[PDB]
Amino acid sequence: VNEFGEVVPDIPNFKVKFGKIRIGQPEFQEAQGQRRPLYPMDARIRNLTYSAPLYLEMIPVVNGIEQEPVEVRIGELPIMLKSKACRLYGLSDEELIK
Amino acid sequence: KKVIGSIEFGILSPQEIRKMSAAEITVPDTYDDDGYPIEGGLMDKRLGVIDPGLRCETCGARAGECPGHFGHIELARPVIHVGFAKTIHRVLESTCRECGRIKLTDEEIEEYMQKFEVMGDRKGAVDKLIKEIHKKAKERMVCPHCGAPQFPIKFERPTIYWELRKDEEGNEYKHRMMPSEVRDRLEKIPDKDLPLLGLHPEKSRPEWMVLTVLPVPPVTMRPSITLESGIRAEDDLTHKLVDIIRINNRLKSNIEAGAPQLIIEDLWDLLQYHVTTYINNETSGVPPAKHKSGRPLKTLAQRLKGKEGRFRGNLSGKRVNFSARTVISPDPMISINEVGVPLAVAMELTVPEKVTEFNYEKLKQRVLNGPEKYPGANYVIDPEGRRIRLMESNRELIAEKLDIGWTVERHLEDGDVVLFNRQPSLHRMSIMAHRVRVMPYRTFRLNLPVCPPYNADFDGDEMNLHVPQTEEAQAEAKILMEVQNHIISPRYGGPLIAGIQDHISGGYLLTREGAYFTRYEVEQMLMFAGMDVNELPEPDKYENGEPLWSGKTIFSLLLPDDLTIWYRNKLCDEPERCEALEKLIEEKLIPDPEEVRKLAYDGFVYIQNGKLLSGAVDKKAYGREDGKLLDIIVREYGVERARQFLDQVTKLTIWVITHKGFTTAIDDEDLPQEAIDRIHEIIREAEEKVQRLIEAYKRGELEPLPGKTLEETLESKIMAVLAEARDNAGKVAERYLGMNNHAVIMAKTGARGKILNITQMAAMLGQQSIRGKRLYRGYRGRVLTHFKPGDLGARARGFVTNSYKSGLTPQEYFFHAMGGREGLVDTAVRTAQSGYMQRRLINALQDLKVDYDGTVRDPTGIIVQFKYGEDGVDPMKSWQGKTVDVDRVIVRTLLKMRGG
Amino acid sequence: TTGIPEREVREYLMKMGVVPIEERRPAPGLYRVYLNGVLIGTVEDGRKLVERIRADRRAGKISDVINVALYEDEEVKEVYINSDDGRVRRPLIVVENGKPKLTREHVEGIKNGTLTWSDLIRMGVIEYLDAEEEENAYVATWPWEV
Amino acid sequence: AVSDDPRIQQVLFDNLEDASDISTQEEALDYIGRLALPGQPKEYRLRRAEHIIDNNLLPHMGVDPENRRAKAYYLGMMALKVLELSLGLRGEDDKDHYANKRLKLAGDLLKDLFRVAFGQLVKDMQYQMTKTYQRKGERYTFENIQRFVRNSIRPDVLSERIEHALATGSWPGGRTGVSQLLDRTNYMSTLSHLR
Ligand SMILES: [Mg+2]
Ligand SMILES: [Zn+2]
Ligand SMILES: [Zn+2]
């Protein structure tokens, strides 16, 4: 992201500078939107994509002056099992059975 | 009911495309969209039916029995065909413009009329004659009839043409040639010049090469693939033909209203380009017209060709019916020409039977029994042609008067000829008609001696049979292709279907000196090996312990009554005691079998009058390579005798190897202590001789070889020392361990063994090389990182010194994996080069027959070889290159006459 | 190998005697310290500098993914430093003047719950070789023959 | 730029002087534009050789024409290495030795798949700002970008490119077969497929 920075639109006045990224816990919203955490045995049994949402804030630059950053989610991202970012990391023996 | 005599080729005239075509297509549209696929254009405008709608060009013609029909496109601009373009260029630069002549003198007109009838036969000789005409017409600029009218220089590469014309004095502007300008020139050539080229005045006019009207391929060649349930995947031919008509439509409007004269010429080339991919997508200098997802279009040239096209993929090689494919598993209890068939596969393959007069009692029962119980039928056929499936709810009303002439399809039974196949189909003999026998399990069975023709083994392979049906194609399989006709091979004469692993090493245990069988064991094995003899095992030759026989006379019941053969085999370790036996034989032709012959050996086979007096049977009497006791029984006593010599030997030999034991435990590889110290003094001094020869190179005492350089002489000398060391230690072990364990019995006679890998299991493993070089790949001057660098010693550059019993240490084991991976690469590499090399030789040589007067002739009638193969004996039946074999004949005929 | 920021290694060599490209002649100066394929700097004595980095790695000052190989041609001399992210390595035990380092007194510590593999490579007894540092080594096979 | 060793230096004057009297300075830059296409391009002449050199000659040093001073030293060093092997000063380098054969794996591969999918989402974002500025004109000034940004994204463009390239194994760089389904029979064979 720090390669791109500000690029365009065509109007000379407004530009957008890119901020930082955070990665949320693996969750999934269906139709009639409702967000609950996924659990990989459930995500290999009804054809899902075990994934996490990708939040990215942007900087509205009005003639130089930065005044209010808004965080917009861009998309989703697949996530590796038993990695540091998924829900099974450091999780004890009697719970992996659960 | 005629047949095709000859096919004559040519070019379609544009006049004939209109008369052949039934409709012109003017609507650039396929479906538009997802409902009512009917237009006034490319779909069924009385053009071709693919739907269940009966509308065609007035002829009914539902989709079953409907030939598709051709449409045409009135192209507004003339269009160069792609395939002719290299040969249109040969015409344009070799003609005098504006009149039509040939740019030749009157001498060559009268000479090359006359040269046509002289060379009127061979294709290759007249093809060079048409190139020199192109050569002589290029280097002339003065015609005899137009006064040199400023000939321009033509041009090519790849498709766009030009001319180099002068206007003021000497200009070199590249005037682009128009396709309309070309076709106007071609019409001015008179028809008499077409024999002077390679053309024909009624079938190939040159002006017809320029596509003025493009024909449309039919509906039956362009199907409509459905994707999920109602979505139609457009065909690759359909997708480009729609896009041709929409670039036409605008072009028609462009020249009818627009007049800027510049975009036209730009548009002109788009038309050309867009149909050019449709003939051949994979030309050079042309971007591939892709499908709009990332796939190229398989156009006509990819439909014709491409390693799976429509000469080899679907026309001369097709997928078949009435077959099966499963795994194999041995049994040595059926005859040599039978086969097992599982009972599930036997009820899903059928023969037609055509009840005449004498099987009518049989096939009444086969149709009364249903298609469940194993004698049963599936499909009955009336003489009209309406088949009647039998399965449903009654057969009694079909088991009525069966009306002689019908055709019943029943299951396979014991007797119906099948074929068999291995699929890699290398040589002539890997398809052979067997004789079905039905046994309940799920594997094809196969007699053990018939497994060097198929080149198979039994670690889960796959063999496929396929029943032939019509009564002419079935009697060809039984007479010409049964197993017993193929007992010898056409590559070297020697027998091919013969004994294998147990049949050899069992036969050595029967004819050893000391093989005395008791009375119960003789009587039991003669019943088991097929044969039928009465109470004459006589006469109880050694009653010293008990009344028990010898091993020779149980083997001397299988031979015919007047054999006479004597030869030397592999077990001869003392040539002097064979000599003595031979000497008596050559001077006193018939001695007495009692007295002198009990001076015998175990390495000189001698049979007379069907009685083996002296010998020991090994792999010189059977075998995949030469055995001259099955060999001399197929040339003297028919063939049908030698299928029951090999059927009775096989079951006799496996009996004695079963109830006598042939185990091989771990102590068979073992050497006592004093023999092992004999080996270790060899390995010590052989390493010291290596260490000395490095010192000669290091101090400048080179002693060079003439061919190689000093680095290459060193490596040469070393390997010889190492070789000798391993061969000298192989001789120590072989001398010591006796011929009484069950690991050298398998190696002397020969059945899956050598005398290398029994002394590569209690001795060295030699050096360890890789395609001739010694092991050198690795770090900078050291193969593994356990060795001091700058070292060329034996132990440090690929040389193991421990057995497969005394353990490999991790540098030696890692040296052995390097030599082991070299063997596995060269299996999959060498197989693919031989397969393509066979396709050249079959397809160049498959035309040749042998006529009745003994002459091999090509398809053109040119005699290739008189009196076939340096006349004239079949290599299947010649003996070892030679002919009639007088030598054996003389001895055989004299013996029989004199002996009486 | 995992990865490390490059700039920390660049600053670290500059005070240890690296004479940069501004000064080099170079030949024949027994020179050319490389870094991930990039040529930066020159040092004078090969035997002083290639032992200096390895002795520092087995103390704990520099990070643990750094490994120095030397090239000893008759006329050419290169000093290689490798700090990329995709190499393949292998563990060995340092020997020193004939004695295998860290004998039994640590092995009961490994057998007990005191220390582990995270502690042995920090204490400087296990060494990760590349394919390239392993060129200079000379490795035994058993503890008997050392 | 090449070397200062005198034994190398006398060889370089032979290859220099043999062709130095054909083309002079700053005219061979134009001659590369003569070679790639003919017949007085002029506008294609200057401009393609400026486009080739800044984007094909050694891109790991930079893309700016400032960086051309550094690329002369790098390519000067490769022409060094050809010419001490002709004399004999090193040995041949084998391209199997694991000193120069690295392994890019699932951390480094998946960053390349992210670069293409994020670069295509930014270019699709900018099209939805220019085709909405005029259709509605002017709105709340500081709340423009608080409402222009969140409506001009349509999140599904990013995530499909991530999934479909890895559920088929055909990545936009050119690699094929980089996603093989996990072989699952008998625990020794799932573990061996992860190595
Ligand atoms: Mg097999
Ligand atoms: Zn029709
Ligand atoms: Zn003329």
Write down the experimental method used for this entry: cryo-EM
| Nearest of B181, B108, B105 to residue B143 by alpha carbon | B105
Q: d(Cα B758, Cα B746) in Å, to the nearest integer?
A: 10
Distance between CA atoms of residues D134 and D128, nearest Å:
11
Amino acid found at C117: W
Contacts of B365 (CB under 8 A, 6+ apart): B375
Burial, C138: exposed, middle or buried (Cβ in 10 Å; 0-12, 13-18, 19+)? exposed
Q: Which residues of D touch C76 (CB under 8 A)?
A: 89-90
| Residue of chain C whose alpha carbon sits nearest to that of B809 | C141
Sequence ranges of the domains in chain C: 3-84, 85-146
Structure tokens at C132: 């390239």
One-letter identity of residue B800: V
Q: Inter-chain contact B788–C138, Cβ cutoff 8 Å? A: yes
Task: Check if the beta carbon of residue B175 is closer than 8 Å to that of residue B54.
Answer: no
DSSP line for B321-370? SSB--B-EEE-TTS-TT-EEE-TTTTTS-EEE----SSSHHHHHHHHHST
- Chain D residue closest in CA terms to C82: D99
The token duo for D105 is 């794996």
| Rounded alpha-carbon distances, angstroms, from residue C20 to C13, C14, C53, D72 | 10, 8, 18, 19
Which residues of D have a CB under 8 Å from any CB of C? 3-5, 77, 89-90, 97-99, 102-105, 108
Burial of residue B296 (number of CB atoms within 10 Å: 0-12, 13-18, 19+): middle
Collapsing DSSP states into helix, strand and coil, what is residue D46? helix
| Mutant choice from D96, D97, D168 vs B, greatest count of B C-beta within 10 A | D97
Annotated binding residues of B for Mg(2+)? 457, 459, 461
Distance B185 CA to ligand 3 centre (A): 14
DSSP-assigned states of every residue in A29-87: E-SS--EEE--TTTTTTTT---EEEEEEEEEEEETTEE---EEEEEEEEE--TTSSSST
Give D94's contacts in chain B (Cβ within 8 Å). 777
Closest by CA to B42, choosing from B241, B189, B181, B232, is B241
Among the bound ligands, name the one nearest to the CA of residue B146.
3
- 3-class secondary-structure state, position C67: strand
Provide, as residue numbers in chain D, all residues whose Cβ is less than 8 Å from the Cβ of A33.
none
Which among C34, C80, C85 is the top mutation candidate for probing chain D, defined by the most D β-carbons within 10 Å of its own β-carbon? C85
Task: Map tokens 């940069």 to a residue.
Answer: C20
B777 interaction partners in chain D (CB closer than 8 Å): 94, 96
Q: Which ligand is nearest to the CA of B47?
A: 2
What is the Cα–Cα distance from A26 to A37, expressed in whole angstroms?
A: 6
DSSP 3-state assignment of B614? strand
A33 Cβ under 8 Å from any chain D Cβ: no
Spacing of C-alpha D77 from chain mean position: 21
Structure tokens at B782: 């050291």
Enumerate the β-bridge partners of residue C128: C91
Nearest CA of chain B to the CA of C140: how many Å? 6
**Rounded distance from Cα B215 to ligand 2 centre (Å):** 17
Measured CA to CA in angstroms, residue B708 lies from B692, B704, B797 at distances of 20, 8, 21
Contact across the interface for C131 and D103, Cβ inside 8 Å: no
Nearest to A14 among D145, D150, D159 (CB): D145
Closest CA to B771 of B813, B829, B812: B829
CB atoms D90 and C73 under 8 Å: yes
What residues pair up with C33 in beta bridges, in sequence order? Answer: C79
The Å distance, Cα B831 to ligand 1 centre, comes to 15
Which residues in chain C touch residue B780, judged by CB atoms under 8 angstroms apart?
Answer: 135
Contact B237, B222 (CB under 8 A): yes
Put residue B530 in one of left, alpha, beta given phi > 0 → left and psi -120 to 50 → alpha. Answer: left
- CA B756 to centroid of ligand 1, rounded, Å: 25
Residue B758: name the closest of B778, B736, B780, B774 by CA. Answer: B736
The closest ligand to the CA of B102 turns out to be: 3
Identify all chain D residues contacting C85, using CB atoms and an 8 Å cutoff. Answer: 108
Which residues, in sequence order, are CB contacts of B316 under 8 Å at separation 6+? none
* Centroid of ligand 3 to alpha carbon of B14 (angstroms): 29
Instruction: List, in order, residues 6 or more apart from B258 with CB less than 8 Å away.
Output: B264
Cα atoms in the 13 Å half-sphere on the side-chain side of B876:
8
Maximal CA-CA distance, chain A: 60
> Which parts of B are annotated binding residues for Zn(2+)?
56-57, 59, 66, 69, 96, 99, 143, 145-146
What is the number of CB-based contacts under 8 A between chain C and chain D?
27
Q: Which helix (H) or strand (E) holds B566?
A: strand B564-568
Residue position matching structure tokens 């000064």: C23
Q: Do D126 and A9 touch (CB under 8 A)?
A: yes
* Chain B partners within 8 Å of D174 (Cβ): none
B68 Cβ contact partners less than 8 Å away, ≥ 6 residues apart: B47, B48, B217, B218, B219, B220, B221
Residue pair B95/B189 in contact (Cβ under 8 Å)? The answer is: yes
Chain C residues with CB within 8 Å of chain B CB: 134-135, 137-141
Of the residues C71, C76, C139, C145, the best mutation for testing chain B's interface (the one with the most B CB atoms within 10 Å of its CB) is C139
Ligand lying nearest the CA atom of residue B457 = 1
Q: After which residues, if any, is chain A broken (C to N > 2.5 Å)?
A: none
Name which of A10, A16, A72 is nearest D150 (Cβ-Cβ).
Answer: A72
- How many Å lie between the alpha carbon of D28 and the closest alpha carbon of chain B? 28
Dihedral of the alpha carbons of B437, B443, B446, B447, in degrees to the nearest 10: -90
What is the spatial distance between Cα C43 and Cα C17, in angstroms, rounded to a whole number?
6
Which subunits have 3 or more CB–CB pairs within 8 Å of chain A?
Answer: D
d(CA B292, CA B305): 23
Q: Which residues of C touch B810 (CB under 8 A)?
A: 141
> Are B747 and B757 within 8 A, CB to CB?
no
CA distances from D134 to B366, B802, D151 (A): 87, 87, 15
For D161, other C-beta atoms within 10 Å of its C-beta total 19
Domain C3-84 belongs to what topology?
Hypothetical Protein Ta0175; Chain: A, domain 2 (3.90.1070)
Amino acid identity, position B218: P
CA distance A85 to A92: 16
Query: How far does D97 lie from chain B, in Å, by closest CA?
Result: 7
Bridge partner list, C35: C38
Contact, B399 vs B364, CB < 8 A? yes
> Residue D112: enclosing H or E segment and its boundaries?
helix D106-130
DSSP, collapsed to helix, strand or coil, labels residue C34 as: strand
H/E run at residue B161: none
Strands (E), B125-170: 162-165
Q: Flag if B786 and C141 touch (Cβ within 8 Å).
A: yes
Give chains near C: 3+ CB pairs under 8 A.
B, D
Three-class SS string for B440-463?
A: CCCCEEECCCCCCCCCCCCCCCCE
Tell me the CA–centroid distance for residue B464 and ligand 1, in Å.
Answer: 14
Distance CA B447, CA B435 (A): 12
Resolution (A): 3.9
Q: Which residues of D touch A78 (CB under 8 A)?
A: 162-163, 166
Are B548 and B517 contacting, i.e. CB atoms less than 8 angstroms apart?
A: yes
Kindly give the pairing relationship between strand C34-35 and strand C38-39. antiparallel
Token pair for residue B532? 């039928």
- Do β-strands B444-446 and B328-330 pair in parallel, antiparallel, or remain unpaired? parallel
Query: For the packed helices D68-87 and D6-17, what is the interaxial angle rounded to 10 degrees?
Result: 110
Q: Which residues of B touch C135 (CB under 8 A)?
A: 779-780, 785
B58 interfaces chain C, CB cutoff of 8 Å? no
Q: Could you give the CA distance from residue C111 to residue C108 in angstroms, rounded to a whole number?
A: 5
Do A and C touch, 3+ Cβ pairs within 8 Å? The answer is no
Interface contact C138-B810, CB threshold 8 A: no
- Please tell me whether the peptide bond between C28 and the residue prior to it is cis, using omega within 30 degrees of 0: yes
Specify whether the CB–CB gap between B784 and B811 falls below 8 A: yes
Which of the ligands is closest to the CA of residue B424?
1
**Cα(B323)–Cα(B290) distance, integer angstroms:** 40
How many A from CA of D193 to the centre of ligand 1? 26
Contact by Cβ (8 Å): A96, A55: no
